[PDB]
């Protein structure tokens with residue numbers, strides 16, 4: 001009725017979709033990345049708005065405030081729980097979908113760029129490349145991830161040891177707050193600008209665009225991928241890795257992927273084969289690396305190479321909006337501060353990763369720049385002392401095959417509890433996991449006590465400052481979801 005009435009006064013009607021609209025199913029599904037959340041049993045938005053101008057976003061928020069219809073914002077749609085376009089329980093909401101606002105304006109000489117939230121990471125990276133072969137930006141690894149959610153929740157990838165997370169390399173933003181007002185760094189103040197850069201999506205307003213500093217990379221980088229089965233000595237090698245990798249020079253990141261009794265060591269090095277080989281021989285000879293393992297290429301070519309194994313298809317891999325990969329998926333994460341006993345590595349490789357519904361485990365080492373930033377300097381607290389992060393990933397491809405992978409995910413998380421961080425058990429906000437806890441709503445406001453349960457896991461000692469900031473910029477909890485920062489007020 002009147003919410004829609006208000007929208008049509010301010011926004012071109014071709015940018016508005018109701019459930020009855022012919023294109024609604026298509027617009028809704030276009031950036032859903034998880035087949036668990038696309039099916040008809042999921043709660044759907046009442047309306048979808050696809051702005052092309054910032055004034056459309058402002059109008060949508062004003063209308064929502066006036067008619068008390070809450071808005072969930074979607075940029076790339078990768079939210080692991082789908083909270084950008086679905087709710088867990090029946091309720092009325094509109095989705096503001098930013099996929100049409102996708103400009104990237106790079107200033108090569110100043111080494112800065114303005115990037116719309118609706119741009120995907122691959123589009124950002126590709127625009128940086130068109131400006132310079134020796135500039136980069138340290139955000140996620142997956143090209144179809146949206147800038148908006150990736151930066152809001154922190155954002156890290158293969159440059160994290162060198163340059164930290166995306167959010168700490170953001171120098172300004174353009175944001176629409178809960179009253180429809182347009183803000184930048186100057187107008188929003190220290191607290192709000194601190195919170196929005198890593199404090200998770202949705203909670204602190206709709207970010208329209210981000211200004212980033214662009215960072216130097218050499219014209220040639222080197223990648224290798226070396227696998228070790230357990231008979232090839234994987235357990236002893238990974239047991240050494242967990243101590244060595246966090247301490248390596250910042251130019252060298254060695255992550256691990258495991259999906260059975262075999263570990264694949266994937267390395268990105270900001271330099272040439274010529275200097276890498278002696279570094280490896282000196283610091284990590286157990287891996288058995290030699291020049292035949294090296295793949296030299298530009299930074300921009302390393303993005304599809306690391307993620308997909310592709311060397312030959314830059315535009316197709318980075319500029320892709322077909323949305324073809326739509327697994328059913330479950331995810332969990334952990335942080336590790338103390339080395340695992342060799343027996344735990346034996347169990348993970350020989351036992352947990354050879355079970356029905358077993359998934360994939362990805363291990364990213366910290367240390368260096370990401371660990372040098374104080375824990376409270378940004379909302380992202382997983383810094384000093386971190387050896388590595390773990391992501392537990394489960395994919396399946398048929399609707400009725402969820403039981404086994406969901407059970408595995410729960411069981412291995414229980415198994416790992418004694419060896420990972422605790423009090424709280426830390427997790428990465430952008431690896432969203434609703435089983436960590438969800439909000440309770442009382443008198444139409446999310447409660448501080450329910451928020452704290454999962455909030456301390458994502459944000460540790462930063463959670464209370466996030467909530468106090470929330471209370472100042474959005475006391476009525478307009479921008480929320482089931483796992484958004486609750487307001488903490490007078």
Ligand SMILES: *Cc1cc2c(nc3c(=O)[nH]c(=O)nc-3n2C[C@H](O)[C@H](O)[C@H](O)COP(=O)(O)OP(=O)(O)OC[C@H]2O[C@@H](n3cnc4c(N)ncnc43)[C@H](O)[C@@H]2O)c(*)c1C
Nearest residue numbers: 075076077078079084140141142146148149156201202207
């Ligand atoms: C699907 C997927 C996710 C990945 C992948 N690899 C990652 C990597 O290498 N590094 C990472 O740091 N993260 C990786 N992730 C996780 C993604 O970073 C997260 O899933 C991001 O949150 C996704 O962002 P986006 O694609 O924009 O997802 P949405 O579902 O639109 O939003 C997430 C969340 O944030 C809110 N939000 C969106 N847009 C905005 C704006 N503009 N302002 C404020 N808040 C925003 C949403 O409401 C929602 O709550 C690899 C793959 C394949």
Ligand code: NA
Nearest residue numbers: 421422423424
């Ligand atoms: Na702890």
Ligand code: NA
Nearest residue numbers: 330331433434
């Ligand atoms: Na989940």
Ligand SMILES: [Xe]
Nearest residue numbers: 177178204205
């Ligand atoms: Xe806000």
Ligand SMILES: [Xe]
Nearest residue numbers: 200201429483
């Ligand atoms: Xe969050």
